Subunit: 159 residues, 6 copies
């Protein structure tokens, strides 16, 4: 009485890289919860809210190949005058206006979202590594209620 | 040289609101572990179990705009006669029956899961605020072994 | 050689306030051990047990800004008829029944757990100040064996 | 001026069982921090390390229904001849080699990770209960630097 | 004027039992400082060390319900041939080997750490009672330097 | 009968390193409570509050492979000219402004949070070792009430 049935399907995602380190499986696709923000704290150009931090791990590093590392982000800018601010993208209607998302480097400086400007270097050691990062909102004009979600991709430079 | 490889993706979640307080990032989406409960403690209609507490945190409050707040929950009722009991929803097979989840206010009273009846008001103060809540199982009959998971959403009224 | 290895992570907790005093580090989050109690001493409604003492310590107080302080406690009541009794919350099963936790002021009167009614005032002095408090069990009926854990939050008023 | 705004989502997790006791909400999903271990302490097959303890707590126990309890762990073995040694799993790259984790019973003996061989029985009493356990590393050869995380599941027998 | 500031959190721990006596708050959870021991005194199997005393205090005892009391200890044994010796557990590294902790009854004998074999009975009187105990090291083989932390739990059997 | 039921999941976390010592399980992930601080003590740039101490514990040290150790910290700075000040990150709504966190060394000097500038070396001994550290707030300007949470990571050099 075997009583064999059909179970389903399993999908595997991965990548093979020729580099000194390998990005951790928990950092290739992660979601950061920023939380709600009051419009009273975003009332003029240049106003910023508080910051939320996230990390990127590097496994199996080898210092005999490379000793430094840097991360550069790529995404859609809010306009041509603010090249370091992300643009919100949730749906056709519902997103807020005159607001964006900034990414702060290890030195507290905003990162240009062009995919070529890399962050500050960080010395590595054999084994696991961690590179800190922060995110925050950045008002451009008068903020309005709505949703605020954004996506971005990053690349790593070992040298 | 300077080896560059592809990295991953980062997804940002948030919301902008026009209110006197903002929900904390750790309270927008949280899970509560109720733990196991014996069927012998749920034998007849109206029987309950011990409660488990969870909190909702409000940040950056201002008492010059509003001085009180209330929370109303929304979810699927278990029956037309039990409007204040949630219904279990995990999968198509392998869930308990004749049991539900109740949400208790800070006055020990059950909350109607219609999204309109708000809980008891609580005086706020400038800065961080916390609102207590409790959850417990409610039996509408004879309990049956199985899984017990539920979901609900809340809204905040700043009166 | 050097032989550098990965270490760990350190988390820092704190708060910046605008008031005459500041809560001590050991009083921000503390645990009070009530100890066991016999059901024979809790037989009917209104019965109480012995009290266990705890205190809140204030630091860097200044008498030129404020002169008196008071504390209000917020928590989940046991029912609508007993607003000064805190409800137990440990897990889904294994908690005692028809029993709660009462918090007594330095005057010996139980405080309502609504976050608005403050305790009796106490004159302060420059430097370190401590405010005494007591906790005891309270029975609303025939007590049953089980666990008895509870949590509460407090706010400080500087009048 | 109600000024109602959207909040968030709450997820509830639990289970209903027909047994003499119920597992504590704090023991259905727990993390054990083993800490770092030097490679010099793991040089040949069969070499172990120091132990770290963890507990499983049972609530609302009834002696009439049952008087003894035992558990059995299920997980992925590291090898065909090492069925009592759990295999590490953290990511594709960056994990220690030739080493696993062992789960010791209250009699100091290892446990087969097949989900069928239960541990030594323990007498119960009415109310809460605690069962002790220990975990340690186990070398199957020359150890290699890396990360070491693992997972397992357990079941309870109320004989 | 009326500056209100958020404070902190208070946690209460306790238990309600149906028995003749209740355990004092100072004996529910306590730490015993054994101090350092030279490895020269622990050189072969069966070697012991000097004893360190600790007490378990019972409150509100009644001589009508019960007349005598006894306790049993439950913990992880060091080996299958040594069932009355605890096993050291502090971390994955830096712990002593071939050394365990032995608990002695008021009669001078060592108790088995199975949670079923209770110690010698002790006559009680109305009011407060204390039960003496002693702890010492026990060498299974040749001692090695390291830490010697341990933990255990006890149950009281009124009769 | 047996009446076997389902339990839960156990998560094990650890690391295997090739170094002179190993970090204790209690020091790889710890929380430090700083307590509240008044804005009156943080009014100008360079003003500092009191200090709170914490330790990093090393186990199973060997004095034949290495004799001295050092610790370097990594985190997100608050400004380009304040590389020795850590930035606050709790949420996107409520956090103190112009206030950071400094990490002092056993020499009393602040450490640069770049992950390369190690602290002052300390002589080790065979067995357990402890390295002291202190943390404090640092004001870059006029302080603002809010939360003051922060995180950081460290690495060890066994020179």
């Amino acid at each position: 009485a075997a009583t064999t049935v059909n179970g389903g399907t399993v999908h595997f995602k991965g990548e093979v890289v020729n580099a000194a380190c390998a990005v951790d499986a928990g950092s290739v696709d992660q979601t950061v919860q920023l939380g709600q923000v009051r419009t009273a704290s975003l009332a003029q150009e240049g106003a910023t809210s508080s910051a939320v931090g996230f990390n990127i791990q590097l496994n199996d590093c080898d210092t005999n190949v490379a000793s430094k590392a840097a991360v550069a982000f790529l995404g859609t800018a809010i306009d041509a005058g603010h090249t370091n601010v992300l643009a919100l993208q949730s749906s056709a209607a519902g997103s807020a206006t005159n607001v964006g998302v900034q990414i702060l480097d290890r030195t507290g400086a905003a990162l240009t979202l062009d995919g070529a400007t890399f962050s500050s270097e960080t010395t590595l050691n054999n084994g696991t590594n961690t590179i800190p990062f922060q995110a925050r909102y950045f008002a451009t004009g008068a903020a309005t209620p709505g949703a605020a979600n954004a996506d971005a991709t990053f690349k790593v430079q070992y040298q």
